[PDB]
Amino acid sequence: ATRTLVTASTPGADMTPGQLDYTSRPLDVALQQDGWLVVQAADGAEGYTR
Amino acid sequence: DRLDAALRFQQEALNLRAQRQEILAANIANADTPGYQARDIDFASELKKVMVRGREETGGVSSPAVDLLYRVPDQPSLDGNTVDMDRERTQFADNSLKYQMGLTVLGSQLKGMMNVLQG
């Protein structure tokens, strides 16, 4: 056994929060670390976002 | 009968050389086909077999009655063929020289006979 191949992969994503821009608007919100806002997805399902 | 028997060993060896080279050329042709195990024959055992019992064919699509054995692969491959090109080209060159040797021996014997007959 000598031949071993390479396969690229994307193991999930990065959950480290970014930097918060302070905008003087009441509707722009930022969640806690490892927290998600819930939206109704495109196909009538549920999705989570930041 | 006597002359046929005296020239039969080298003639049969040369025919088996031709068939082995056909097999090796088939292996070289299928070298990039995925899922092709390389085939080869044991020259000595098949030569003795053809010697004791005459040549035979499966049909006659026709093919010889030789046993097509599988070559042991050297290193693995994802496509799934065991045709290792170094082995194929070494066996091809060796079979080439041995076929030329058979031609030389048979031609020498036939001249060695025309020398006697000629007068």
Curated annotation (Swiss-Prot), chain A:
Domain of life where this protein originates: Bacteria
Subcellular locations according to the entry: Bacterial flagellum basal body
Family: Belongs to the flagella basal body rod proteins family.
Assembly: The basal body constitutes a major portion of the flagellar organelle and consists of five rings (E,L,P,S, and M) mounted on a central rod. The rod consists of about 26 subunits of FlgG in the distal portion, and FlgB, FlgC and FlgF are thought to build up the proximal portion of the rod with about 6 subunits each.
Name of protein: Flagellar basal-body rod protein FlgF
Species the sequence originates in: Salmonella typhimurium (strain LT2 / SGSC1412 / ATCC 700720)
Classification of source organism: Bacteria, Pseudomonadati, Pseudomonadota, Gammaproteobacteria, Enterobacterales
Covered residues, full protein: 52 to 101 of 251
From Swiss-Prot, chain B:
Function: Structural component of flagellum, the bacterial motility apparatus. Part of the rod structure of flagellar basal body.
Assembly and interaction partners: The basal body constitutes a major portion of the flagellar organelle and consists of a number of rings mounted on a central rod. In Gram-negative bacteria, at least four rings, L, P, S and M are present, whereas Gram-positive bacteria lack the L and P rings. The rod consists of about 26 subunits of FlgG in the distal portion, and FlgB, FlgC and FlgF build up the proximal portion of the rod with about 6 subunits each.
Family: Belongs to the flagella basal body rod proteins family.
Localization terms from the record: Bacterial flagellum basal body
Superkingdom of this protein's organism: Bacteria
Main location: other
Protein's UniProt name: Flagellar basal body rod protein FlgB
Record's keyword annotation contains Acyltransferase: no
A single BP term in Gene Ontology: bacterial-type flagellum-dependent cell motility
Keywords per UniProt: Bacterial flagellum
Any one GO cellular component localisation term in the record: bacterial-type flagellum basal body, rod
Coiled-coil stretches noted in the UniProt entry, renumbered to this chain: none
Keyword Zinc-finger listed: no
Knockout mutant characteristics: Defects in flagellar assembly process.
Pfam families: Flg_bb_rod (PF00460)
Gene: flgB
NCBIfam families per UniProt: FlgB
